[PDB]
Specification:
2 copies of one chain form a homodimer.
Chain A (H helix, E strand, L loop, with lengths): L3 E5 L6 H14 L7 E5 L5 H11 L4 E4 L16 H5 L5 E4 L2 H6 L4 H13 L3 E6 L3 H5 L3 H16 L8 E4 L13 H16 L3 H6 L1 E4 L8 H4 L7 E4 L6 H14 L1
């Protein structure tokens, strides 16, 4: 399993920053073989990202933060896989904890997105993860099993074929609570195992990134675990140094 | 009231298409000056749209098809008014029927976006409109007033100053009915009259666009009515010759 490190920029970007960051990023990662590095900028900046990376002749993968369920038509305001494809984007974050909470995206909704992306030749980065209370209640796997089965129990285990899964420890996050590399590995082993129950080939191959708070000096403690295959990075993704660091750590560590 | 004709491109666009459309459109509007022409492409193409319009020295206005409630922060996949301002996008469509239906956006949500747009210096194109069963049940004004009050009752009529309102007869859309310039004009005066009950000054100046199916053949019919101040165009927006025809008719109708 080749590690994959993705930067989720979220709702951050500007014309100056995008160029700076992507250039800095390219510099830092100059010849840093071993990992797959991807960026997910706001839709408004996918055009710029593409142009900047292409000039730079960069190897960074272009992604996007969500998708909708149609390629074209009377769908005012929607995100189209076919349109994203025109800019080279290929890694689409879906089910993120923020969309699920704020936009009330459901398991079935996110599963349809999963299927449509795959149908379009794109790579889904399916996010799963339990709340603070589902965690206090010791329901972590009930939840992760649930969110994952919405795909498996419809499309079938195979469907995770060439997809990335990202585990979000929503329970931690400024709430004084913290996930450790041990917690992370514990959990990632259970998820993989859940997949190994229907298919072991699939399970051993599926990249399962860790979505918790990972920093330059966390990174290798995490990338050491055998079931953690990369990271979906939040804040560190906004800094070329920090983010390249995390990418490097995973490259070697693996 | 100076007319505004906006093309909502919906889920339509491509690199080659965006530049051909904007270039032909700008060629067609050469002497035209009595109508504001705005264009709303998918977010993915707002940058390309800007680049094309700028190179051309075009006067066409850039807009977008939706917005969210934050400028920056932890909101994966959201739309930012501030990021939109960087590309020069000013007219922002909110409340469109396709979002109200497919994304279940409430009047409360839509109203929150209106206030945020005003907070950021942008122009909201507030869509309102009733369905088939409401129209048959003849509750057109209760629905429209309900939806306008969402912003009026929480922000004051003056909040409409500088905004654009687009009536969408959804009942006519996709369900065998048809609106006429005469039915349209009747609905716009009721809408204007509701706003006027709170402020005459605001009501006199607000641009209320017609959102039904407008086409180059039926446009002068609509722009002829005194309470129809432009159009929010869909399908006819995708062609430079059709969209420019609708813009021109509005220009003359209101000269």
């Amino acid at each position: 399993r080749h590690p994959v490190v993705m930067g989720n920029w979220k709702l951050n970007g500007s014309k100056e920053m995008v160029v700076d960051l992507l250039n800095g990023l390219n510099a830092e990662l100059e010849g840093v073989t071993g990992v797959d590095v991807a960026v997910a900028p706001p839709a408004l900046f996918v055009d710029l990202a593409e142009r900047t990376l292409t000039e730079a002749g960069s190897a960074i993968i272009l992604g996007a933060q969500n998708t909708d369920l149609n390629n074209s038509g009377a769908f005012t305001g929607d995100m189209s896989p076919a349109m994203l494809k025109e800019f080279g984007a290929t890694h689409i974050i879906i089910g993120h904890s923020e969309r699920r909470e704020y936009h009330a995206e459901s398991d079935e909704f996110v599963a349809k997105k999963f299927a449509f992306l795959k149908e379009n030749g794109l790579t889904p980065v399916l996010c799963i993860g339990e709340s603070d209370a589902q965690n206090e209640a010791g329901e972590t796997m009930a939840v992760c099993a649930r969110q994952l089965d919405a795909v498996i129990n419809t499309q079938g285990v195979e469907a995770l074929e060439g997809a990335i899964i990202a585990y979000e420890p929503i329970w931690a996050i400024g709430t004084g609570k913290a996930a450790t590399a041990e917690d992370a590995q514990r959990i990632h082993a259970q998820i993989r195992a859940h997949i190994a129950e229907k298919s072991e080939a699939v399970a051993k191959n599926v990249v399962i990134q860790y979505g918790g708070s990972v920093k330059p000096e966390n990174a290798a403690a995490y990338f050491a675990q055998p079931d953690i295959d990369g990271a979906l990075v939040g804040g560190a993704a906004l800094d070329a140094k920090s983010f390249a660091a995390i990418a490097k750590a995973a490259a070697e560590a693996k």
